[PDB]
Amino acid sequence: SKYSQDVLQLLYKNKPNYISGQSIAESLNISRTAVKKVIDQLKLEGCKIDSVNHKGHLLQQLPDIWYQGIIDQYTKSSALFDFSEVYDSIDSTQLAAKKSLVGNQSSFFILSDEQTKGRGRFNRHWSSSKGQGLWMSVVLRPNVAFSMISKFNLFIALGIRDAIQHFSQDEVKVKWPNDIYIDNGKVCGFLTEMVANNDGIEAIICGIGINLTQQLENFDESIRHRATSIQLHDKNKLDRYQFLERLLQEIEKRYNQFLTLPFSEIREEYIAASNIWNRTLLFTENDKQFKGQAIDLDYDGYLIVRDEAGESHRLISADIDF
Amino acid sequence: SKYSQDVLQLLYKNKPNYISGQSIAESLNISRTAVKKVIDQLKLEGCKIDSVNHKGHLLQQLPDIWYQGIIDQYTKSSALFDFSEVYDSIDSTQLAAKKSLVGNQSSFFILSDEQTKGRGRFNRHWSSSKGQGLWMSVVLRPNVAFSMISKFNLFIALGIRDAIQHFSQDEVKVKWPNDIYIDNGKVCGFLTEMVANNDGIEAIICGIGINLTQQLENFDESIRHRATSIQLHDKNKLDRYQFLERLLQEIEKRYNQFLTLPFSEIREEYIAASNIWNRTLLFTENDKQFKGQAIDLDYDGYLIVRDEAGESHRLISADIDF
Ligand SMILES: Nc1ncnc2c1ncn2[C@@H]1O[C@H](COP(=O)(O)OC(=O)CCCC[C@@H]2SC[C@@H]3NC(=O)N[C@@H]32)[C@@H](O)[C@H]1O
Ligand SMILES: Nc1ncnc2c1ncn2[C@@H]1O[C@H](COP(=O)(O)OC(=O)CCCC[C@@H]2SC[C@@H]3NC(=O)N[C@@H]32)[C@@H](O)[C@H]1O
What we know:
Chain A is α+β, with helices and mostly antiparallel strands.
């Protein structure tokens, strides 16, 4: 219905209290039976709504679906984001964000339940199943030189890792520059992009894909031995709204640090959060492949690497395989 | 008409020969009187078309209007550009290009007769009068690191300056990093932007605005003492199609050099093409202003400056006033 999101937003706003169907009807200026039909439909999609005679309706639990009405409350109370766009299915939130940022200076995020053309680094396929992960692009407006893109990427990683760690009983680690792991399984990839010129960044677009509720059978093919979801490491049901709220909080925290601190302030905590040390790594550089060991992360965020031939490299980015 | 661009493209294709109305009618599968009406309308907009009984029509001259039908011939025979978009009026070709490049790897350009929201560096107003200049954005796909943006900007300047110089009896000079001058008048501003991440450039967007046919009375306000058009320096009528063709050629030439040569190969020719030397310059850095002298352009394209206090600076970009 036209009014399903409005009814949902009133339910959400009123937690922990019940609201009457009559009160929702007066807010939206619709009949009481139209309100009943909307609530019957929301319950059908998987909202747990407790309805008690003479008292009204309490939203108790939301399904694994993004609702614009609820996300609207997340943005209303945000000091970072002006708005959000929520979709059931789209080609890519990253493409959507790149189009939406043009001609304005808004900060915003895009969420979609599904992507049909999700891409990672190097334009690799990113699997984005309906109702099973968080597929998001975040647009921000830092007043910084374009070379700061690498620094951003280091701060945001810790914010993502912290959010995931809150829901996982297992050790969550960063794999520089762009992956989050739990044990031997990738739970998240994120991709930082920019629109920039010589005078500065016009926008940062951070694409973030986090596996939330896949069982291993849901991972399909042979990323399976290499992939994991938060639910596989959580004894409790993972609630996507609880998670999103925690994630938005850590992103804002880490984004304020990016704006105000040198990377050297964060560098030790980043080292201790990393799973790249004391192991042989496979680097790919265009058509070249070589093995090496990561020996340090310098004060400017460059990986210091000693290859199998004994030669040192100082790398702003790489693609690393375990 | 639906067919005006098609008729125009056939006329253009057939130069220097006349084509009959009957032959245009058979190509487009329309009546002979529909062809006559299209030609009558094109003549009304300012096309000079010579019509002779029994023989047909020759396009002799186009007006100061961009026609998609003609621009289509420029792209068909291009080794650089896959397509173009031509508009009579748009907010900005730069905004249009930023939207159009998303989700593809095409190389292309956008032209508009007018812009209602033309912007330069720092989001300054760029005046874009209907029928008086070339207002263009070019999208290219160099396979390079994001830090190469500054180098691109140095090569393209010489290509623009060369094209303008061909139509001007006066000395055309580059004002680093982003302006082209004839004497004391700015004839052109260009703006290089990119979409990039740590793995490379996804697109370069070069916004190029060249004043073609303004009289001084057309410049309005008090940019007048500081602004000029190519026509004010040309004894001949300036033909925008001739100019565009020359400009596209020099851009491709200079873009191939960017891909294959170090800036040190071009550096002396850039110095000799510049009007910034042996004069006091005003620099603006955020809220700071200072005077200085440009003393050299280094091998990486950095301006070397000695300020009024005697201190040296090495600058990748600046905003300079005379
Ligand atoms: N759902 C998944 N979970 C764990 N691994 C996956 C996966 N789908 C694909 N993979 C594997 O991990 C690699 C991903 O490549 P990279 O390391 O280049 O690239 C990345 O790690 C980052 C992906 C960013 C995805 C988000 S989803 C929201 C936004 N919209 C987009 O379209 N993109 C962003 C693949 O080559 C696969 O082996
Ligand atoms: N038509 C004009 N001719 C000469 N000067 C002008 C002018 N309009 C404005 N100006 C002056 O020059 C300055 C322009 O600022 P900058 O130096 O920051 O910035 C530039 O020099 C570059 C402009 C790029 C314009 C093109 S037109 C096609 C494409 N689409 C766009 O929207 N933009 C690009 C202004 O502050 C004015 O003083």
